Design a protein around this ligand. Structure first.
Ligand code: PJS
Ligand code: PJS
Ligand code: NA
Ligand code: NA
Lengths: 330, 330
């Protein structure tokens, strides 16, 4: 039911946006079908983890606060697609970076990124036009989007001096995860479910924020280990953190427990595209027993998560019963 | 006074944004100074035509409707910088297209473009937090921003079939000018001046929209002719419309009055980087007496502008006395 309903609302949102362009923006059919194909290509196909969470939060809050049910669930579906379109916008922005007379493909990619972001506003301004939360929804959405761009700056420049391994620390790694990922992937869907369920001021936002940051940290650490050790045909992509000199959990944990000569061997091999230098880094990770530390670190984070949900149910029992699927889905 | 006041409010907006990052987004001083330099580089140095217009509209409306004066003028200055930051965002997006291991300059440019746009929201959400128009201001701003991205699509794909000279027509040229430029350069500053002056529903928006589109058309036609005939050291850049096969006023006017063999000569030479093919196109423009038609076309547009301002003063005399500088500044 949630996935089926989420996909029906997608057709409703797409048709509004495309008809709006045809009827109010003077768009010709060729470009309308061009934009329908682009929207499907960039927004569909993922797992919809962020979008379906808005639904799951909304349905749990109308079970413990007729027509109010139908409207809230539909509102949650629009909010879910706002985040999905936002995610598609971020992915298109990423494709422009690694992809490299007017090159019309780079022009259209930049145009795609601007349209996907604007569509989050257009669908909000339309389907929520008569909602009292429309102004608060836009402000929280815009602020979280700003947060993500700030975290991208922290990530992209973690190895330099914005006009290097000093910023390879656990607290900075958490700062990167916090802003680059956790706020829009974990905090934003939860907040949006609360907004459409009219239960925003009824929850402890501090414990909510703290949970979202902890869950983003847990899933980024797992992502970092898989990026390095999971082979490409099983990970789904090519792990490139070592070559890209990312401030990953493996790097900052290694630098703390490595010897001075191992740090020199790591610093001399990190951030290179050569096959043997990357393998030299993986060898250092293995010999430092990092995957042994990975299990303990995740377990400790899991314990902080498995216990912070309890502080939240004492004032919001249904809300905490929506984050129940944080471990019904890893 | 307007320029001096506009620049003081810039310092106020910059300091808020940078302190917000330092105090609420955990940003380190090195990156704060990096962002101060980026903000100055991208937002300052232009002519501030869009931003100062919000001020000029605001000061004319408090002369024919104490503390309300000071607040409205300051609000107009923030709205002016929203458009300037929006313009800087569009320029950065343009630099990414023509500029072409993780290339950190392309990553930072994309990051710059996201930050400049988000800053328009952050300064609005802060300085207008207690204003009743904050929700309407954001929606009109977001819609105009969406409009511009749609016009960029019309422009960038004017010579192809979105998966060619059929779309080289006067009505499509106006459609490109309308969405790509006129809405955010001419309509948006006027609307924003009305919003902060609490005089939005007091003006004929139709004549206002019609004037903004006509003034954008006039200045784009003049821009198109200068791009082709004004030498680079006098234009300020290198005119590249012929090489880029832009749907310019010269091209669509030429295609209407050229002979079948001249059209073939134009089609065989348009959109090339070769020195002689570009000069062949300029030769065709000269022999078709296009610069003779340019004077008449601008004069006719000027007459429509010099007369549409009168329809607006019969219900908004002070407003039309703000667009007076449309010809006190060409
Ligand atoms: C890509 C990815 N990897 C792992 C998890 C997620 C995710 O956000 N989920 C599963 C939904 C979710 C949420 F939106 C907010 C708070 C908790 C949760 Cl569980 N996404
Ligand atoms: C780059 C450029 N070239 C020519 C004109 C402008 C411009 O927008 N001006 C001068 C301000 C302005 C406005 F914001 C709204 C309506 C009318 C006017 Cl006159 N900008
Ligand atoms: Na998702
Ligand atoms: Na301007």
């Amino acid at each position: 039911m949630p996935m089926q309903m989420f996909m029906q609302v997608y057709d409703e949102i797409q048709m509004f946006l495309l008809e709006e362009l045809e009827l109010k923006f003077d768009m010709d059919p060729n470009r309308v079908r061009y934009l329908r194909k682009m929207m499907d290509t960039t927004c569909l196909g993922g797992k919809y983890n962020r979008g379906l969470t808005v639904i799951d939060v909304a349905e749990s809050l109308l079970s413990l606060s007729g027509a109010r049910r139908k409207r809230v669930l539909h509102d949650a579906c629009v909010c879910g697609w706002m985040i999905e379109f936002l995610q598609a916008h971020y992915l298109v922005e990423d494709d422009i970076m690694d992809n490299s007379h007017p090159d019309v493909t780079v022009q259209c990619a930049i145009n795609d990124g601007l349209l996907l972001k604007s569509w989050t506003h257009m669908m909000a301004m339309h389907f929520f036009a008569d909602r009292p939360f429309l102004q608060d929804l836009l402000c929280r959405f815009n602020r979280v989007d700003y947060t993500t761009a700030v975290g991208q700056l922290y990530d992209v420049t973690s190895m330099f001096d914005s006009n290097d391994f000093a910023e390879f620390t656990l607290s900075n790694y958490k700062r990167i995860v916090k802003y680059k990922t956790a706020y829009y992937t974990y905090l934003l869907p939860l907040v949006m479910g609360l907004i459409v369920s009219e239960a925003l001021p009824t929850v402890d936002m501090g414990v909510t924020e703290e949970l979202a940051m902890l869950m983003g940290e847990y899933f980024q650490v797992q992502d970092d280990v898989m990026d390095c050790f999971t082979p490409p045909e099983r990970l789904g992509k090519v792990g490139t953190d070592i070559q890209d000199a990312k401030c990953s959990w493996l790097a900052v944990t290694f630098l703390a427990k490595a010897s001075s000569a191992q740090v020199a061997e790591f610093k001399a091999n990190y951030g290179s595209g050569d096959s043997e230098k990357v393998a030299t880094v993986r060898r250092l990770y293995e010999e430092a027993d990092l995957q042994g530390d990975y299990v303990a670190y995740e377990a400790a984070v899991a314990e902080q998560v498995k216990e912070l949900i309890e502080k939240l149910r004492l004032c919001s029992p249904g809300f905490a019963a929506s984050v129940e699927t944080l471990w019904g889905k890893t």
